[PDB]
Design a binder for these strands. Structure first.
Length: 993
DNA sequence: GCTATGAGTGGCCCCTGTGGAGAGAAGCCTGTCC
DNA sequence: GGGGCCACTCATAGC
RNA sequence: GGACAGGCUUCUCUCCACAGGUUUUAGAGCUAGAAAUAGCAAGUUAAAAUAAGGCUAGUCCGUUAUCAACUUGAAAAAGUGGCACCGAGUCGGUGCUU
């Protein structure tokens, strides 16, 4: 016999609960076979459990980092182009100058040429640093001076301008000197110097004791920390404000501080508002000044100007040669794209059209067609004729509200739609019914004070074209629709002019000019072919044609597409693409929402599949779920379950799908006092799923209440933590100063971290158990070892490619290949007395046990927690308060059970003693305060990584397991997604000494 | 008589600020419809 | 939020 | 239940850019003193990297999504685990079957 049963599911963002119940609300328990090598061949478990998983992450960070990488690469390319231009003349003066510039980052030992970059000699370098303390001084000198200067200084100025060209927020162009920016920066530098001198003098004169801390201590927020340390400008002002208030003569300095102008640096974050035109002007001035000496400058002047001005248009996209999934550019010729010949290579119009169209939705009724623009004339025709199709009007002498004819529709559109941007009900009644039809009293139904459809595009074309006859000609419909498409697709005036150039023959200069200024945004939901492309086989009328005039039927779009006597429904059904059934992964990915809920849905579906496999492949009667997205989950479940068609090819619904809301179950809990505390454990998800299933089955349809109470008191529930292989950044991105340690990772292959510093704290991908021999001690004696080694994310490819060489690189010898066992994150281990630990990383463990607490304690805790906030009748409130007052001794029992559970699995003796001392010290506090503090206490034993918490005013820090050596002899557990299937492997029997 | 290793403990640490252009989805409000 | 790392004391044994 | 039409709000995906921050090196520190050190001077800028790198060599790609174990598979993927009853501190016992 197949015992009828149903599945209840609770779906969140981090957890998926599953419950299986029979017809009588009983939860069966089965005896399962256990694979492995241990003596435990059979384990009994209950058919209830919940799955926990890490929250899903979006793609924002990847997008930002990819954009940053592209920007850095393109800046490097600009610098390389500048150096390629200059190389010919630079070689004539100093051939090794470029070599010196590139290797300057290395230490003196690794440098191949002389250590001083600019000149290679100490005297000239000192002279340059003395005459020109800042690059802005050199910039102003080159702008104003009329003497032939060193080529290397010109290169430095041009490179400094190019590498920091500034923003492009504005198109077009925007001490009397042509370099206001450099002059302003030099003025700020001089003010900084003078103010620093004055500050030092005043501090030394009045308060000499603080001189050393302010001007020598790099560790504080003083001037030294503001310059050589990591102190920010705001922090420096914060620290220096009280000191200036303690001294005299600081009124000017204090006013400067209030304006954030005291001792201001040159390289400041306010530069984000500098237009690129200032840098362009300085560049052009320098080029003009120095072109009279260097022939190559004036010939390549426009190239240098373009390199600064050029940027890739955003609609074009990356200049990829086919092998990038993000690329869409159309490339005319296979030449190497350069900022000088960009115009002749890239089809700007085609690329822009591809960029716009690839995000446009396909027509749902006709998948192989694209929708029309929201401001398309044909779309506006469709909307207007659809609205006026169902309009009912009541005049004098009319018993029934009549329907408008096509002639009336055309007349009304011509009179008001083509003359008014929007047509209202009152305006219609006054202008057509009162004037044209000469009816004094007319009542219109279906439209609220204004028509939602309007001919805005027609009015724009009337304002611009100013020719009504050209607009009203059907022979122009193709040209007008193409014009509207062109206006919607592009935003660049140049491309708009280029494409409309073909139709410029029908219009004057000004008409073409104002057309170039119009833009439209938005798109419709139907395609051209659907509305007016396909024709009826008999009458030849399209959907639009019927909407214009349909006789007494006056059928709307929905009626036409569901009309059995017309071929529109036939064509729509025939056009349904019988494409490959989307893979459930990609099918779920096609949904709208955060990827986390998609992960939850996929896990839920796999849980359902495994449960069906467990129950002997006999499908349940009902599936209860709780969370459009819920509707899509229900659709997916129905599609996967009901798969057989009857003789009439109808859908055989062997399994019914149920959707429920949390409020009903919450009310059921409140009425029958089945309260839950979200902090005690994770069984609440399973209990909520069980309640969902029970309530659904009861609604569709003392024993039941007793059965529910018995079920909710079960201690054995299957909690499974889904293992995940960590991915992402190689390590923390904060570069740290050099230090003699083996834990640093180099930024580049040949950059020894001991001399350059680098990255720190790699993220562990996974660990593998290794049994081998390692030479330890000064005598290099072989020692057989057995330990866990964590593999970084950066080394995953090397490890997977050839594990043997990678392990030998670490010093391990005699590696037994078949003994390597991959252990993903959160792998489960079993210890003595049932104590369980989850492998968090290579060197840290997490608590892997769940506290089983009886229901009556949970009810008492809930009642005490909201003792003064009960929402119900006064009799119920007083009953609950009295019941709380009856059982004050439960607190001692709760503390005792917590102590026992801690002594059994937590092993936090110092923290447990602190907890006991705090509990004894605060035993006279109000009951509700006691409950509030005790609720926080369960964080100590909750599943997951240990965390700190507060108990009254005493704080208990987190207890961390800093050594994974105990699991080296434990029993490894592999659990299926529902945890019903297990495979247990004993690590102790492997790798004996 | 001296060191080395591991073992635990407590505490500190973690890249950030903005602009432009579009496309799409979803949640509410009104009207008509299948 | 949770894992990585450093400064410190200590356990413990080989020598 | 679904589709279209007007409005409010939030959220998601792709591209172009900018300003920083961090790191190493250069910017002769001087005086007295064996040195520890004491005093004085100065301090704003500059170059390169900004996930290791890869081959498809592009002015491209490298952090989202996908993953219990065993057999067959490059992988997507397919396949693999008795039942009923009585009990409950992480699940225990009893009866039939292979």
């Amino acid at each position: 016999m197949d015992k009828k049963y149903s599945i209840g599911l609770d779906i969140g963002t981090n957890s998926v609960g599953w419950a299986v119940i029979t017809d009588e609300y009983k939860v069966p328990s089965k005896k399962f076979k256990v694979l492995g090598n241990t003596d435990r061949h059979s384990i009994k478990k209950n058919l209830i459990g919940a799955l926990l998983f890490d929250s899903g992450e979006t793609a924002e960070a990847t997008r930002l980092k990819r954009t940053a990488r592209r920007r850095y690469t393109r800046r490097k390319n600009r610098i390389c182009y500048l150096q390629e231009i200059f190389s010919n003349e630079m070689a004539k003066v100093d051939d090794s100058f470029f070599h010196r510039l590139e290797e300057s980052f290395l230490v003196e030992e690794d440098k191949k040429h002389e250590r001083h970059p600019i000149f290679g000699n100490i005297v000239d370098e000192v002279a340059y640093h003395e005459k020109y303390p800042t690059i802005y001084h050199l910039r102003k000198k080159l702008v104003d001076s009329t003497d032939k200067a060193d080529l290397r200084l010109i290169y430095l100025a041009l490179a400094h301008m190019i590498k920091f060209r500034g923003h492009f927020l504005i198109e077009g162009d925007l001490e009397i000197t042509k370099a206001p920016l450099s002059a302003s920066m030099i003025k700020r530098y001089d003010e900084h110097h003078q103010d620093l001198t004055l500050l030092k003098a005043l501090v030394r004169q009045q308060l000499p004791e603080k001189y050393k801390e302010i001007f020598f201590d790099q560790s504080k927020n003083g001037y030294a920390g503001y310059i050589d340390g990591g102190a920010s400008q705001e922090e420096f002002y914060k620290f220096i404000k009280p000191i200036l208030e303690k001294m005299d003569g600081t009124e000017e300095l204090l006013v400067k501080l209030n304006r954030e102008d005291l001792l201001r640096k040159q390289r400041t974050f306010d530069n984000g508002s500098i237009p690129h035109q200032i840098h362009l002007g300085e560049l052009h001035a320098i080029l003009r000044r120095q072109e009279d000496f260097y022939p190559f400058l004036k010939d390549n002047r426009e190239k240098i100007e373009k390199i600064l001005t050029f940027r890739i248009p955003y609609y074009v996209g990356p200049l990829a040669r086919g092998n990038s999934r993000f690329a869409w550019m159309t490339r005319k010729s296979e030449e190497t794209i350069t900022p000088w010949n960009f115009e002749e290579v890239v089809d700007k119009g085609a690329s822009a059209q591809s960029f716009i169209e690839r995000m446009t939705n396909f027509d749902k009724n006709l998948p192989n067609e694209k929708v029309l623009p929201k401001h398309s004339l044909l779309y506006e025709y469709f909307t207007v004729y659809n609205e006026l199709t169902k309009v009912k009007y009541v005049t004098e002498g009319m018993r029934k509200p009549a329907f408008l004819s096509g002639e009336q529709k055309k007349a009304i559109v011509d009179l008001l739609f083509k003359t008014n941007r929007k047509v209202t009900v009152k305006q219609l009644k006054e202008d057509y019914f009162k004037k044209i039809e000469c009816f004094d009293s007319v009542e219109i139904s279906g439209v609220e004070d204004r028509f939602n459809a309007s001919l805005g595009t027609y009015h724009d074309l009337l304002k611009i074209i100013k020719d009504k006859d050209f607009l009203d000609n059907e022979e122009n419909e193709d040209i007008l629709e193409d014009i509207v498409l062109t206006l919607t697709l592009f935003e660049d005036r140049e491309m708009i002019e280029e494409r409309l150039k073909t139709y410029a023959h029908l219009f004057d200069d000004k008409v073409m000019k104002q057309l170039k200024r119009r833009r439209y945004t938005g798109w419709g939901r139907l395609s051209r072919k659907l509305i007016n492309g396909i024709r009826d086989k008999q009458s030849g009328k399209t959907i639009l044609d019927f909407l214009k005039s349909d006789g007494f039927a006056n059928r709307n779009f929905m009626q036409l597409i569901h009309d059995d006597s017309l071929t529109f429904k036939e064509d729509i059904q025939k056009a349904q693409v019988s494409g490959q059934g989307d893979s459930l992964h990609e099918h779920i990915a096609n949904l709208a929402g955060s990827p986390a809920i998609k992960k939850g849905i996929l896990q839920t579906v796999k849980v359902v599949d495994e449960l069906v496999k467990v129950m002997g492949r006999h499908k349940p009667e009902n599936i209860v779920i709780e969370m459009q997205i819920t509707k899509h989950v229900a659709q997916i479940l129905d599609s996967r379950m009901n798969t057989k068609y009857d003789e009439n090819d109808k859908l055989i619904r062997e399994v019914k799908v149920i959707t429920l809301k949390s409020k009903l179950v919450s009310d059921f809990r409140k009425d029958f006092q089945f309260y839950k505390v979200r902090e005690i454990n994770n069984y609440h998800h399973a209990h909520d799923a069980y309640l969902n299933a029970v309530v659904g089955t009861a609604l569709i349809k003392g024993r039941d209440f007793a059965t529910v109470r018995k079920v909710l008191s079960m201690p054995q529930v299957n909690i499974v933590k889904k293992t995940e292989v960590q991915t992402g950044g190689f390590s923390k991105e904060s570069i740290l100063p050099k230090r003699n340690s083996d834990k640093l990772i180099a930024r580049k292959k040949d950059w020894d971290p001991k001399k350059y510093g680098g990255f720190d704290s790699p993220t562990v991908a996974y660990s593998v158990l290794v049994v081998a021999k390692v030479e330890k001690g000064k005598s290099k004696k072989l020692k057989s070892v057995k330990e866990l080694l964590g593999i970084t994310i950066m080394e995953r490819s090397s490890f997977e490619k050839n594990p043997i060489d990678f392990l030998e690189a670490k010093g391990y010898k005699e590696v037994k290949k078949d003994l390597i066992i991959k252990l993903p994150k959160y792998s489960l281990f079993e210890l003595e007395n049932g104590r369980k630990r989850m492998l968090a990383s290579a060197g840290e463990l997490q608590k892997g046990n769940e506290l089983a607490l009886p229901s009556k304690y949970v009810n008492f805790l809930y009642l005490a927690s909201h003792y003064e906030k009960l929402k119900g009748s006064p009799e119920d409130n007083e009953q609950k308060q009295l019941f709380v007052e009856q059982h004050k001794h439960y607190l001692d029992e709760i503390i005792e059970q917590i102590s026992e559970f801690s002594k059994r699995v937590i092993l936090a003796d110092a923290n447990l003693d602190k907890v006991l001392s705090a509990y004894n010290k605060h035993r006279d506090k109000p009951i509700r305060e006691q409950a509030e503090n005790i609720i926080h206490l369960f964080t100590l034993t909750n599943l997951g990584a240990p965390a700190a918490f507060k108990y009254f005013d005493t704080t208990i820090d987190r207890k961390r397991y800093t050594s994974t050596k105990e699991v080296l002899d434990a029993t490894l557990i592999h659990q299926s997604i529902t945890g019903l299937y297990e495979t247990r492997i004993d690590l102790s029997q492997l790798g004996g000494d």
